[model samples]
Target chain A: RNLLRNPCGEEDLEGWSLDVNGGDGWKVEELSRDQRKEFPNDQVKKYFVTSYYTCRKAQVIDLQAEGYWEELLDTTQPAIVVKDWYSGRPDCGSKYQLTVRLLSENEDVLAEFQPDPATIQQKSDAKWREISHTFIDYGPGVRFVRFEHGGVDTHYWAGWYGPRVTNSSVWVEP
Target chain B: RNLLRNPCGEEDLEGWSLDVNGGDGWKVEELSRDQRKEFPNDQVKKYFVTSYYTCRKAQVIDLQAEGYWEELLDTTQPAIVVKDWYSGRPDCGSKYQLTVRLLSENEDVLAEFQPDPATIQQKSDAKWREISHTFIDYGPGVRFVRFEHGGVDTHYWAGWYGPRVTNSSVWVEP
Candidate 1:
């Protein structure tokens, strides 16, 4: 089960911590009919659209609150998986970035996944794509997981023609 | 919070128990662009489409599993509110019915809401409409909530041209 709440922008950005509300910020829009076929999950009907400038949002999951016992976190050290889907509008180019971190009780970063930012050009296929990562062997003291992702339009258009995202998830493997 | 899962058919009927799987059975489909304007919650982007024959589905929610304690359930007795949305395609007429029951530990019905079945005529406005009910003063022992709804198209057009349902909710008020 996914620990992230409102992962598909279904609640219009609820449960997200907006760190950089630049330009027009973030908006939730219905996925286009064409884009719908490209998305893997038919259950996700909406996406978070970024503005011309950087519009970042985040969520931190408390392992214990999410039902992960301290013994399991310290001894078993199960795999923590993260996945996110993103796309650019057919007419607009965009930039996207994802950052996830495992933290200790005092919020000290134990491990991190910060991939190279992606750039989608204008008039490209603009199909939805998934980015995933798994955390393992990150010793102990892991108490929280932070997931953050955001994007901006290369064209600098006024409206929400930037990168689109939906169906984000963070799960603790059994 | 809604006790009903997959209320808007977002998970492709994963959380529902299909009682009357008639005709083509039940399907999940994207709400039409025009119909989206009439729906109350923007978060709901899909609906459950019934078939040419009666296609019913249901869900039984255990109040204790949903966080209601015995004392609260047998004493204070908070109101259990139920709401559902239904509509007919602009080109087809249909029928819809909703039944909600508050049950006891032994599965005995403590109260119920079963309104007259609705009929939408062909070529009418075909706008989405809401039906709601509240269970109050039902003298304790309410341990579960059962929500069931379904419909069929009058035209009998093979595919899913029946009445559409979505955004069904059963909430135990705070």
Candidate 2:
């Protein structure tokens, strides 16, 4: 079954402009019939990404065809959680940044972070626990979460702003 | 089955929680089966996010039968975006302030939110972005991001800091 980001998964991996990207491995057009000569017999799996913009999400739920391929986020760089939004592709080139902020009852915000891409980024309200998680660009924005460095003292991670929602837990009695 | 934030779709309906955070029109629990009986059937073909928390993108490939219910960053207490190893449930309230220290060679985040539980947060590469307010709570010390209202002056914001990943675009000088 040729699937594109399993819709049944617990995470949200949709909201992409499919016209541009194809699932890493499943490039319906870029394949050769002779390639099929080797055919499904080759059992090849090279963690590909979708050429179609709609193709994000490191893991998918289903596949539509038997021999079709799928897009896979590069394991070479762990998985960039893409915790935030962006304007370019890291693989395509350099020069891209992630952004963050909150829609607080008080006002709006817009913070910026410039961490390396080889690091892994994760967060928790640990203190205040009122809200859960929210989706950024929905798919692409998230696909690029931070990378995981064993323990390097550098600001380099896969690169994506962190996810921070407001909490009412700390609001003590006035 | 399709769902509606407000099942009623009524001419005018009262909201729920009915107390501290009542009257939002997003009624999920709190009401008895009889009270719930009034909500419109799944026929309107359109729904609104009556309950703010219930609305978010889904990554069905990984989600279990349970449901999506999170509370991180600025919002959750004792937050768990990266607390232990497997992210704590949304109910554990013990949040810390959102924090970022121009992460550099001097310091590398581990990929946790709560300093104790696993507060070593990480990012992808230099090509990242999470720049929208929302970034606050750097714990221990406080960083103030201020802005003024009016033209030339957008608005005023004062709270947690957001990260600003380096933009590789700039490095590509002709």
Candidate 3:
């Protein structure tokens, strides 16, 4: 794995990302634009359009990990959504730390982590593990970023569904 | 546990909230006013201020599983910066299903099951757990719907953390 091979990547700078890594993505807008629309206009919708700060996988899986980037902007046909996010695993055993990180244009690290690591492993077996992080850009060179993952394997469900911001409802969980 | 009591929470038809279940906290204005007096306007370092939705636990708890609502808007706070919401828990030895829902001010269900049963077992274990469901809102009224259970308590975690008119994002288990 190359030290810098973003699987679903672009570059970004300008959000929670640091000036050190200009390619990081700063998607505070994803918090309000891409996924925000799924929320009720007259009601508070949790987890709807919280900003994304692209970050490097906390730790490289292999000598290093590969990454991919995607945008959740619904203006496009395929709005990014997450089918599920788990912190640990049951069948596979042991707790897996699952989370989503956003990258930015210019390849700087925009937002590193939306979910704290320890908080992730607290949930259960394989939630974030069963998802994937894809990459997308609105337009070429317009300045954007995509998705990426850092874990034990690529075939992991963590890479399958990929994380896309989804749409939900207003009633309480049943 | 008083599982059938309703205190008649302060309701909002337009989605505006005056009663943050959590007490009003330190204000940005207070912070800024002090900054302005302490530092030079131009020479002072550039700063960014984002007020977050009330994640502080409420002073009250309810029993009616029909649904519970908390008005989280800080009247003095401008937009909200959501950092994920996790507000309940059940014994749920195997795992606790923490469901977060979003609703409109008039009690209209807009989005529910926002984050699929976030298994709240890991990160914390106080019987009553604190989970984080994040969101970002520009303007508009909204509510958070939730459910919780040890697979027995049969309650859920759901709530609104967004203006939705502008953006939203959701993650489960992560």
- The local distance difference test score of each candidate is 0.77, 0.21, 0.25
TM-score of 3: 0.24
Model 3 misplacement above 4 A: A1-78, A82-93, A108-113, A117-174, B1-16, B19-174
DockQ of 1: 0.01
**Tens digits of per-residue lDDT for model 1 on A58-129?**
899999998999999977678788898887777765677778898999999887776545555456477777
Better of 1 and 3 by lDDT: 1
Deviation in Å, model 2, residue A42 alpha carbon: 16
User: Which window of 10 residues has the lowest lDDT sum in candidate 3 chain A?
Assistant: A165-174
The candidates, ranked best first by lDDT, are 1, 3, 2
Which runs in model 2 stand beyond 4 Å of their true positions?
A: A1-46, A50-174, B1-95, B98-102, B105-174
Per-residue lDDT of candidate 3, residues B111-156 (tens digit): 3332323222222332222233443221134443333211212234
Model 1 stretches astray by more than 4 angstroms: A1-174, B20-24, B152-161
Error of 3 at B146 (Å): 8.9
Q: Choose 1 or 2, whichever is better by TM-score.
A: 1
Cα lDDT, model 2, residue B145: 17
lDDT of 3 by residue, A1-174 (tens): 122222212222211222223343222122335333433352322221112222223212211022222322222212123222222222332212234333334554432222222212222333322232222211222122232332222323432211222221111011
lDDT of 2 by residue, B26-107 (tens): 2222323442333333232222222322111111111111121222222221211211001111222111122222221223
